[PDB]
Amino acid sequence: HPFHLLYYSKSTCAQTLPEPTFEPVPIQAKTSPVDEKTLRDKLVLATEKLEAEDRQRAAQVAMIANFVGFRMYKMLSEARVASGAVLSPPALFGTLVSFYLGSLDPTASQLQVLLGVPVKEGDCTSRLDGHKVLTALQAVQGLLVTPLLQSTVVGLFTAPGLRLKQPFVESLGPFTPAIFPRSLDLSTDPVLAAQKINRFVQAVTGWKMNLPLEGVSTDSTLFFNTYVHFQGKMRGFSQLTGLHEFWVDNSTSVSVPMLSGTGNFQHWSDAQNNFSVTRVPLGESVTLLLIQPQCASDLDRVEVLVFQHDFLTWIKNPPPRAIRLTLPQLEIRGSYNLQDLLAQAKLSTLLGAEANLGKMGDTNPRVGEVLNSILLELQAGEAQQPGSPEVLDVTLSSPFLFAIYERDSGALHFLGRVDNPQ
């Protein structure tokens, strides 16, 4: 199970300045919108110059991100339902890696164990190098997007008067260049602060993120909010004009626009547990997995059996075949406070009251919430002969599961349940 490339190397661990701090500008300050095209350009350049070692490193980080992602999705299912769910294991993994990059001895060893990596109480070369991990995680993001958009902006919101340490904020660079430290009152009122954060995110990203705060604290001095926007314009598929019936529940249904494409996709059906997968290539390495249960009356049971478990043995590689796949256009919006998922795993004090985060600023900050908000989009992008006698149509017109997988890293990037696509 070596994670050798993630640990501190003897040369770096073999290696003082008083940390210079700064105060974020007010969250109301006018800010240039984010250019998602620029975020792709850089990510690509990041991939193109990867060495063999760097790809090996990305492979290791993917395993963990996947494993943690499964453990977190287990928590997320229990928390709750009508919309369904979406989780992004890398975005979620790098969020914790950031907190590790700002933590000290007690929390530093803990967060590392939460992230899966073993620690030796005394050894320095058994501790995670956060910078290596984040760059390795930047390799994973890059391999996903080489048409496919993956923007991740981080909103680092601070209570006014709290100064952040410059070295820390820099550390998080590989994770994303779209990090935004901003200051607001987190103790005046939670709803008012909530609308300030939303007003800012909307402004810069452009993405409307329908985010209900599941209440909020009034003694917080630091929010950490990761905002992912995947957009997959899928080749072969095209919009069908007019809406079409999707089956939501035993007594209710809705008519929504579907995209559709013929092609040589991989499709099979698991007999052991009564479901069927449909595998669509989004690109040269990316694959969209679509799982539909034999009957929608045990989608909960299949989900527990496929996602929640670490094994992707249920994933297979049989021969391609002519299939006319039909599925809804996706505007999946998800949002979850990671603090609540840790509470579900009974790790409330991990990033809670006594969490040692001394590297983050001049004063040890009280963390408010740790949001991850997704906008996952599948759309028409711009094969055998139309109406070939060998075309079995797989059609997803009722609750189904999805996952996005990248072969080089082995990274599961996105996964979730679609109970209703509006």
Curated annotation (Swiss-Prot):
It is found in: Secreted. The gene is Agt. This is Angiotensinogen. InterPro entries: Angiotensinogen, Angiotensinogen_serpin_dom, Serpin_dom, Serpin_fam, Serpin_sf, Serpin_sf_1, Serpin_sf_2. In response to low blood pressure, the enzyme renin/REN cleaves angiotensinogen to produce angiotensin-1. Angiotensin-1 is a substrate of ACE (angiotensin converting enzyme) that removes a dipeptide to yield the physiologically active peptide angiotensin-2. Angiotensin-1 and angiotensin-2 can be further processed to generate angiotensin-3, angiotensin-4. Angiotensin 1-9 is cleaved from angiotensin-1 by ACE2 and can be further processed by ACE to produce angiotensin 1-7, angiotensin 1-5 and angiotensin 1-4. It comes from the Eukaryota. Belongs to the serpin family. GO terms for cellular component: extracellular region; extracellular space. Glycans are attached at residues 250, 274. CDD domains: serpinA8_AGT.
